[PDB]
Short mmCIF file of N, CA and C in Angstrom, two decimals:
data_model
loop_
_atom_site.label_atom_id
_atom_site.label_comp_id
_atom_site.label_asym_id
_atom_site.label_seq_id
_atom_site.Cartn_x
_atom_site.Cartn_y
_atom_site.Cartn_z
N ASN X 1 0.86 -1.24 0.00
CA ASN X 1 0.00 0.00 0.00
C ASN X 1 0.88 1.26 0.00
N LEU X 2 2.10 1.15 -0.51
CA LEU X 2 3.00 2.31 -0.73
C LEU X 2 2.99 2.68 -2.22
N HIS X 3 2.48 1.78 -3.08
CA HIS X 3 2.19 2.01 -4.53
C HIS X 3 3.48 2.28 -5.29
N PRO X 4 4.26 1.23 -5.62
CA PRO X 4 5.56 1.41 -6.26
C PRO X 4 5.41 2.02 -7.66
N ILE X 5 6.38 2.85 -8.03
CA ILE X 5 6.45 3.52 -9.36
C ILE X 5 7.52 2.83 -10.21
N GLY X 6 8.17 1.81 -9.69
CA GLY X 6 9.16 1.04 -10.47
C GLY X 6 9.82 -0.07 -9.66
N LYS X 7 10.91 -0.62 -10.20
CA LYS X 7 11.75 -1.66 -9.57
C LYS X 7 13.21 -1.40 -9.97
N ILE X 8 14.15 -1.75 -9.10
CA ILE X 8 15.62 -1.58 -9.32
C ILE X 8 16.26 -2.96 -9.18
N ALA X 9 17.22 -3.27 -10.05
CA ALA X 9 17.97 -4.53 -10.03
C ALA X 9 19.46 -4.21 -10.11
N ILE X 10 20.23 -4.78 -9.19
CA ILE X 10 21.71 -4.81 -9.30
C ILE X 10 22.11 -6.28 -9.17
N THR X 11 22.32 -6.91 -10.32
CA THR X 11 22.52 -8.37 -10.47
C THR X 11 23.82 -8.75 -9.74
N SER X 12 24.82 -7.86 -9.77
CA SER X 12 26.16 -8.11 -9.21
C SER X 12 26.10 -8.36 -7.69
N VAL X 13 25.08 -7.84 -7.00
CA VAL X 13 24.90 -7.99 -5.52
C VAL X 13 23.50 -8.52 -5.21
N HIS X 14 22.83 -9.14 -6.19
CA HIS X 14 21.54 -9.85 -6.00
C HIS X 14 20.52 -8.93 -5.33
N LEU X 15 20.47 -7.67 -5.74
CA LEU X 15 19.49 -6.68 -5.22
C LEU X 15 18.36 -6.54 -6.23
N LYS X 16 17.12 -6.70 -5.76
CA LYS X 16 15.90 -6.41 -6.54
C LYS X 16 14.87 -5.80 -5.59
N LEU X 17 14.57 -4.51 -5.76
CA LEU X 17 13.67 -3.78 -4.84
C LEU X 17 12.71 -2.91 -5.62
N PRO X 18 11.54 -2.63 -5.03
CA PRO X 18 10.63 -1.64 -5.60
C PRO X 18 11.22 -0.23 -5.50
N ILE X 19 10.89 0.60 -6.49
CA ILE X 19 11.15 2.07 -6.45
C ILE X 19 9.84 2.74 -6.03
N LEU X 20 9.94 3.65 -5.07
CA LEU X 20 8.78 4.35 -4.47
C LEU X 20 9.04 5.85 -4.53
N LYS X 21 7.97 6.64 -4.54
CA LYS X 21 8.09 8.12 -4.67
C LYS X 21 8.25 8.76 -3.30
N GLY X 22 9.35 9.48 -3.12
CA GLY X 22 9.65 10.18 -1.86
C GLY X 22 10.37 9.29 -0.86
N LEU X 23 10.88 9.91 0.20
CA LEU X 23 11.73 9.30 1.25
C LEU X 23 10.94 9.19 2.57
N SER X 24 9.67 8.77 2.52
CA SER X 24 8.91 8.35 3.72
C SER X 24 9.71 7.23 4.38
N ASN X 25 9.60 7.08 5.70
CA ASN X 25 10.35 6.05 6.44
C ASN X 25 9.91 4.70 5.88
N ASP X 26 8.63 4.55 5.56
CA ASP X 26 8.05 3.29 5.01
C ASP X 26 8.74 2.94 3.69
N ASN X 27 8.85 3.91 2.78
CA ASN X 27 9.52 3.78 1.45
C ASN X 27 10.97 3.34 1.64
N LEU X 28 11.71 4.01 2.54
CA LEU X 28 13.14 3.72 2.83
C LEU X 28 13.30 2.34 3.47
N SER X 29 12.25 1.80 4.10
CA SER X 29 12.28 0.48 4.78
C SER X 29 11.87 -0.64 3.82
N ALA X 30 11.24 -0.29 2.69
CA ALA X 30 10.64 -1.25 1.74
C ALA X 30 11.47 -1.37 0.46
N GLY X 31 12.20 -0.31 0.09
CA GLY X 31 13.04 -0.30 -1.13
C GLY X 31 13.73 1.03 -1.35
N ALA X 32 13.80 1.47 -2.61
CA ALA X 32 14.52 2.68 -3.04
C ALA X 32 13.52 3.83 -3.19
N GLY X 33 13.72 4.91 -2.45
CA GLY X 33 12.84 6.10 -2.53
C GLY X 33 13.47 7.16 -3.40
N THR X 34 12.68 7.83 -4.24
CA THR X 34 13.16 8.95 -5.10
C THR X 34 13.50 10.14 -4.20
N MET X 35 14.72 10.66 -4.30
CA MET X 35 15.25 11.70 -3.37
C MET X 35 14.79 13.11 -3.81
N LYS X 36 14.40 13.28 -5.08
CA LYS X 36 13.95 14.58 -5.64
C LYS X 36 12.56 14.42 -6.29
N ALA X 37 11.71 15.43 -6.14
CA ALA X 37 10.31 15.42 -6.62
C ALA X 37 10.30 15.34 -8.14
N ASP X 38 11.15 16.15 -8.78
CA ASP X 38 11.25 16.33 -10.25
C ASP X 38 12.57 15.71 -10.71
N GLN X 39 12.59 14.38 -10.76
CA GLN X 39 13.58 13.55 -11.48
C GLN X 39 12.75 12.62 -12.37
N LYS X 40 13.33 12.16 -13.48
CA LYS X 40 12.73 11.14 -14.38
C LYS X 40 13.82 10.12 -14.70
N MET X 41 13.44 8.85 -14.84
CA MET X 41 14.38 7.76 -15.20
C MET X 41 15.09 8.14 -16.50
N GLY X 42 16.41 7.97 -16.55
CA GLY X 42 17.21 8.20 -17.76
C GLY X 42 17.47 9.67 -18.02
N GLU X 43 17.10 10.55 -17.09
CA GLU X 43 17.28 12.02 -17.23
C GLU X 43 18.12 12.50 -16.04
N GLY X 44 18.84 13.62 -16.23
CA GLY X 44 19.68 14.34 -15.25
C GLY X 44 20.38 13.40 -14.30
N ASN X 45 20.15 13.58 -13.00
CA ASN X 45 20.67 12.70 -11.92
C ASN X 45 19.49 12.09 -11.18
N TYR X 46 19.17 10.84 -11.47
CA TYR X 46 18.09 10.07 -10.80
C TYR X 46 18.60 9.54 -9.46
N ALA X 47 18.16 10.14 -8.35
CA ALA X 47 18.67 9.87 -6.99
C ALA X 47 17.71 8.97 -6.19
N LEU X 48 18.25 7.91 -5.59
CA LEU X 48 17.48 6.88 -4.84
C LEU X 48 18.19 6.63 -3.52
N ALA X 49 17.43 6.67 -2.41
CA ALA X 49 17.93 6.38 -1.06
C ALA X 49 17.13 5.22 -0.49
N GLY X 50 17.82 4.34 0.24
CA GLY X 50 17.22 3.21 0.98
C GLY X 50 17.96 2.97 2.27
N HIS X 51 17.27 2.47 3.29
CA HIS X 51 17.90 2.10 4.59
C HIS X 51 18.93 1.00 4.34
N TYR X 52 20.04 1.07 5.07
CA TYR X 52 21.13 0.06 5.07
C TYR X 52 20.49 -1.31 5.37
N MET X 53 19.77 -1.40 6.48
CA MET X 53 19.09 -2.62 6.97
C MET X 53 17.74 -2.20 7.57
N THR X 54 16.77 -3.10 7.63
CA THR X 54 15.47 -2.90 8.32
C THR X 54 15.44 -3.82 9.55
N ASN X 55 14.34 -3.78 10.31
CA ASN X 55 13.97 -4.80 11.33
C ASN X 55 14.04 -6.18 10.67
N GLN X 56 13.41 -6.33 9.50
CA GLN X 56 13.35 -7.56 8.66
C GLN X 56 14.76 -8.09 8.35
N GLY X 57 15.69 -7.22 7.94
CA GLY X 57 17.06 -7.65 7.57
C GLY X 57 17.80 -6.64 6.71
N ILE X 58 18.60 -7.11 5.74
CA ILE X 58 19.43 -6.28 4.82
C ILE X 58 18.47 -5.69 3.79
N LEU X 59 18.70 -4.45 3.37
CA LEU X 59 17.91 -3.73 2.33
C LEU X 59 18.88 -3.16 1.27
N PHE X 60 19.49 -2.00 1.51
CA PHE X 60 20.37 -1.32 0.52
C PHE X 60 21.82 -1.50 0.94
N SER X 61 22.06 -2.29 1.97
CA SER X 61 23.45 -2.63 2.38
C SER X 61 24.27 -3.18 1.21
N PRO X 62 23.79 -4.10 0.34
CA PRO X 62 24.58 -4.56 -0.80
C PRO X 62 25.36 -3.50 -1.59
N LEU X 63 24.98 -2.23 -1.47
CA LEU X 63 25.66 -1.12 -2.19
C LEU X 63 27.14 -1.12 -1.80
N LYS X 64 27.46 -1.53 -0.57
CA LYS X 64 28.86 -1.57 -0.07
C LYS X 64 29.69 -2.55 -0.91
N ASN X 65 29.06 -3.51 -1.59
CA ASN X 65 29.77 -4.58 -2.34
C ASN X 65 29.74 -4.30 -3.84
N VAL X 66 29.07 -3.23 -4.28
CA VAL X 66 29.00 -2.82 -5.71
C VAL X 66 30.37 -2.30 -6.16
N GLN X 67 30.82 -2.68 -7.36
CA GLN X 67 32.16 -2.33 -7.93
C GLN X 67 32.00 -1.43 -9.16
N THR X 68 32.97 -0.55 -9.39
CA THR X 68 33.04 0.24 -10.64
C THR X 68 32.96 -0.74 -11.80
N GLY X 69 32.12 -0.43 -12.79
CA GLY X 69 31.88 -1.30 -13.96
C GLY X 69 30.58 -2.08 -13.85
N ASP X 70 30.11 -2.39 -12.63
CA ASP X 70 28.83 -3.12 -12.40
C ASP X 70 27.66 -2.36 -13.04
N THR X 71 26.64 -3.11 -13.47
CA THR X 71 25.43 -2.53 -14.12
C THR X 71 24.32 -2.40 -13.08
N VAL X 72 23.60 -1.30 -13.17
CA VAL X 72 22.39 -1.00 -12.37
C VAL X 72 21.25 -0.75 -13.35
N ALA X 73 20.16 -1.50 -13.22
CA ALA X 73 18.97 -1.36 -14.10
C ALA X 73 17.77 -0.89 -13.28
N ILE X 74 17.03 0.07 -13.81
CA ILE X 74 15.72 0.49 -13.26
C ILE X 74 14.69 0.42 -14.39
N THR X 75 13.42 0.24 -14.03
CA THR X 75 12.28 0.25 -14.99
C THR X 75 11.04 0.86 -14.35
N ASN X 76 10.22 1.50 -15.19
CA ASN X 76 8.88 2.03 -14.86
C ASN X 76 7.84 1.16 -15.56
N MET X 77 8.28 0.02 -16.11
CA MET X 77 7.47 -0.97 -16.90
C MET X 77 7.10 -0.40 -18.28
N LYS X 78 7.63 0.76 -18.65
CA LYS X 78 7.55 1.31 -20.03
C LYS X 78 8.91 1.08 -20.68
N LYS X 79 9.98 1.58 -20.06
CA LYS X 79 11.37 1.43 -20.55
C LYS X 79 12.26 0.87 -19.43
N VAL X 80 13.37 0.24 -19.81
CA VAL X 80 14.41 -0.27 -18.88
C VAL X 80 15.66 0.59 -19.10
N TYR X 81 16.15 1.22 -18.04
CA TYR X 81 17.34 2.09 -18.07
C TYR X 81 18.49 1.33 -17.41
N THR X 82 19.56 1.06 -18.15
CA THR X 82 20.76 0.39 -17.59
C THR X 82 21.90 1.40 -17.45
N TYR X 83 22.48 1.47 -16.25
CA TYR X 83 23.60 2.37 -15.88
C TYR X 83 24.85 1.52 -15.63
N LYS X 84 26.03 2.10 -15.85
CA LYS X 84 27.33 1.50 -15.47
C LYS X 84 27.89 2.31 -14.32
N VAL X 85 28.13 1.66 -13.16
CA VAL X 85 28.73 2.28 -11.95
C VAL X 85 30.09 2.87 -12.32
N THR X 86 30.28 4.15 -12.02
CA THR X 86 31.52 4.89 -12.34
C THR X 86 32.27 5.24 -11.06
N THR X 87 31.59 5.26 -9.91
CA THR X 87 32.27 5.48 -8.61
C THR X 87 31.44 4.89 -7.46
N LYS X 88 32.15 4.48 -6.41
CA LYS X 88 31.57 4.23 -5.06
C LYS X 88 32.42 5.01 -4.04
N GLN X 89 31.77 5.82 -3.19
CA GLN X 89 32.41 6.62 -2.10
C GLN X 89 31.76 6.29 -0.74
N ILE X 90 32.47 6.47 0.37
CA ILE X 90 31.81 6.74 1.68
C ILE X 90 31.96 8.26 1.89
N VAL X 91 30.83 8.98 1.98
CA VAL X 91 30.82 10.46 2.16
C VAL X 91 29.98 10.84 3.37
N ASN X 92 30.25 12.03 3.90
CA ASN X 92 29.49 12.65 5.01
C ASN X 92 28.07 12.97 4.53
N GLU X 93 27.08 12.88 5.42
CA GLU X 93 25.66 13.14 5.11
C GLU X 93 25.47 14.58 4.61
N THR X 94 26.41 15.50 4.91
CA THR X 94 26.32 16.94 4.53
C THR X 94 26.50 17.13 3.02
N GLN X 95 27.11 16.17 2.32
CA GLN X 95 27.53 16.30 0.89
C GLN X 95 26.32 16.11 -0.05
N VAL X 96 25.37 17.06 -0.03
CA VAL X 96 24.07 16.98 -0.78
C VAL X 96 24.31 17.06 -2.29
N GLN X 97 25.48 17.58 -2.73
CA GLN X 97 25.82 17.85 -4.15
C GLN X 97 25.72 16.58 -5.00
N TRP X 98 25.85 15.41 -4.38
CA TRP X 98 25.92 14.11 -5.08
C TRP X 98 24.61 13.80 -5.80
N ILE X 99 23.48 14.37 -5.38
CA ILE X 99 22.16 14.05 -6.00
C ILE X 99 21.78 15.12 -7.04
N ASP X 100 22.58 16.18 -7.20
CA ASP X 100 22.23 17.32 -8.09
C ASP X 100 22.39 16.87 -9.54
N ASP X 101 21.52 17.35 -10.44
CA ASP X 101 21.66 17.08 -11.89
C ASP X 101 23.05 17.56 -12.31
N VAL X 102 23.75 16.81 -13.17
CA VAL X 102 25.08 17.21 -13.69
C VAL X 102 24.93 17.44 -15.19
N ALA X 103 25.20 18.67 -15.64
CA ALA X 103 24.97 19.19 -17.00
C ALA X 103 25.67 18.29 -18.04
N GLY X 104 24.93 17.85 -19.06
CA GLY X 104 25.43 17.01 -20.17
C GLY X 104 25.66 15.54 -19.80
N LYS X 105 25.28 15.10 -18.59
CA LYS X 105 25.48 13.70 -18.10
C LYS X 105 24.11 13.13 -17.68
N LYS X 106 23.89 11.83 -17.90
CA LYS X 106 22.69 11.11 -17.40
C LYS X 106 23.15 10.10 -16.35
N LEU X 107 22.82 10.37 -15.08
CA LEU X 107 23.42 9.68 -13.91
C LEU X 107 22.32 9.03 -13.08
N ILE X 108 22.70 7.97 -12.38
CA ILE X 108 21.93 7.38 -11.24
C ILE X 108 22.81 7.49 -9.99
N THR X 109 22.23 7.92 -8.88
CA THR X 109 22.94 8.06 -7.58
C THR X 109 22.18 7.29 -6.52
N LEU X 110 22.83 6.28 -5.93
CA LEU X 110 22.24 5.39 -4.90
C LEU X 110 22.86 5.73 -3.55
N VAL X 111 22.02 5.94 -2.55
CA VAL X 111 22.45 6.44 -1.22
C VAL X 111 21.93 5.49 -0.15
N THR X 112 22.79 5.13 0.79
CA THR X 112 22.40 4.44 2.04
C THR X 112 23.39 4.82 3.15
N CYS X 113 23.01 4.55 4.39
CA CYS X 113 23.85 4.79 5.58
C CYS X 113 25.11 3.92 5.43
N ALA X 114 26.25 4.39 5.95
CA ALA X 114 27.54 3.67 5.87
C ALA X 114 27.54 2.45 6.81
N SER X 115 26.58 2.39 7.74
CA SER X 115 26.39 1.25 8.69
C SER X 115 24.98 1.31 9.29
N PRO X 116 24.56 0.26 10.03
CA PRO X 116 23.27 0.27 10.70
C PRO X 116 23.29 0.94 12.09
N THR X 117 24.46 1.42 12.56
CA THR X 117 24.65 2.02 13.92
C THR X 117 23.83 3.32 14.04
N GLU X 118 23.21 3.52 15.21
CA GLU X 118 22.37 4.70 15.55
C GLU X 118 23.17 5.99 15.32
N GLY X 119 22.59 6.96 14.62
CA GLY X 119 23.22 8.27 14.35
C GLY X 119 24.45 8.14 13.46
N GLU X 120 24.42 7.25 12.46
CA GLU X 120 25.49 7.15 11.44
C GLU X 120 25.46 8.43 10.60
N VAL X 121 26.58 9.15 10.49
CA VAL X 121 26.66 10.45 9.76
C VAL X 121 27.20 10.23 8.34
N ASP X 122 27.80 9.08 8.04
CA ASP X 122 28.37 8.81 6.69
C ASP X 122 27.36 8.04 5.83
N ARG X 123 27.52 8.14 4.51
CA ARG X 123 26.64 7.50 3.52
C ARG X 123 27.51 6.78 2.49
N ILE X 124 27.09 5.58 2.09
CA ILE X 124 27.60 4.91 0.86
C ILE X 124 26.90 5.54 -0.34
N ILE X 125 27.69 6.01 -1.31
CA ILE X 125 27.20 6.58 -2.59
C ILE X 125 27.71 5.68 -3.71
N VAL X 126 26.79 5.14 -4.48
CA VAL X 126 27.09 4.46 -5.77
C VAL X 126 26.52 5.34 -6.86
N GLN X 127 27.35 5.77 -7.80
CA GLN X 127 26.89 6.59 -8.94
C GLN X 127 27.33 5.93 -10.24
N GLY X 128 26.46 5.96 -11.23
CA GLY X 128 26.71 5.38 -12.56
C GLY X 128 26.17 6.26 -13.66
N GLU X 129 26.63 6.01 -14.89
CA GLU X 129 26.20 6.75 -16.10
C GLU X 129 25.30 5.85 -16.93
N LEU X 130 24.27 6.43 -17.55
CA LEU X 130 23.29 5.69 -18.39
C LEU X 130 24.01 5.06 -19.57
N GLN X 131 23.89 3.74 -19.73
CA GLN X 131 24.55 2.96 -20.80
C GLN X 131 23.52 2.65 -21.89
N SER X 132 22.27 2.31 -21.54
CA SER X 132 21.19 1.98 -22.52
C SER X 132 19.78 2.24 -21.97
N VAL X 133 18.85 2.55 -22.87
CA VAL X 133 17.39 2.69 -22.61
C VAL X 133 16.68 1.78 -23.61
N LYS X 134 15.75 0.93 -23.18
CA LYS X 134 15.09 -0.07 -24.06
C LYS X 134 13.56 0.05 -23.91
N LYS X 135 12.80 -0.64 -24.77
CA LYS X 135 11.39 -1.02 -24.49
C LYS X 135 11.38 -2.12 -23.42
N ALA X 136 10.49 -1.98 -22.43
CA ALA X 136 10.27 -2.97 -21.35
C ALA X 136 9.52 -4.18 -21.92
N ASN X 137 10.26 -5.12 -22.52
CA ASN X 137 9.69 -6.39 -23.08
C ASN X 137 10.11 -7.56 -22.18
N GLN X 138 9.68 -8.77 -22.53
CA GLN X 138 10.12 -10.08 -21.96
C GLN X 138 11.63 -10.11 -21.70
N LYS X 139 12.43 -9.93 -22.75
CA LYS X 139 13.92 -10.04 -22.72
C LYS X 139 14.48 -9.11 -21.64
N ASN X 140 14.10 -7.82 -21.68
CA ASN X 140 14.66 -6.69 -20.87
C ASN X 140 14.16 -6.75 -19.41
N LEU X 141 12.96 -7.31 -19.17
CA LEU X 141 12.29 -7.31 -17.85
C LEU X 141 12.65 -8.57 -17.05
N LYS X 142 13.23 -9.60 -17.69
CA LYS X 142 13.56 -10.89 -17.04
C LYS X 142 14.27 -10.66 -15.68
N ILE X 143 15.22 -9.71 -15.60
CA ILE X 143 16.11 -9.46 -14.41
C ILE X 143 15.32 -8.88 -13.21
N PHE X 144 14.08 -8.41 -13.40
CA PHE X 144 13.26 -7.83 -12.31
C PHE X 144 12.28 -8.87 -11.74
#
């Protein structure tokens, strides 16, 4: 009853989660929440945040194991957008610049806490560049 607007797959770390609109605590506990009101898949910098771990278990923690070169796919069930990871950082929560649109680039930015410890101030950032956009068919949707 959070009404997902998509799904995210990172095959390299066996992550498959719903994409939800906004960073409600429920959204962050269930999957990847859109960090900006006006972002679109395959445009500017598409920013997604998820909790490191929930009561249930691991959620966006796998981001710590993502490597430069790994593929990240998102879909809205119209098109499938595949990104290639270009960097992974541990950064301070103050570094808001990481989610900003970057002129002439099509980026995805994935954010989670650097650990599950209470009052964690650092964030794992995985960022990638758009490699392909497809029609959401049988072939392209298999990974979700």
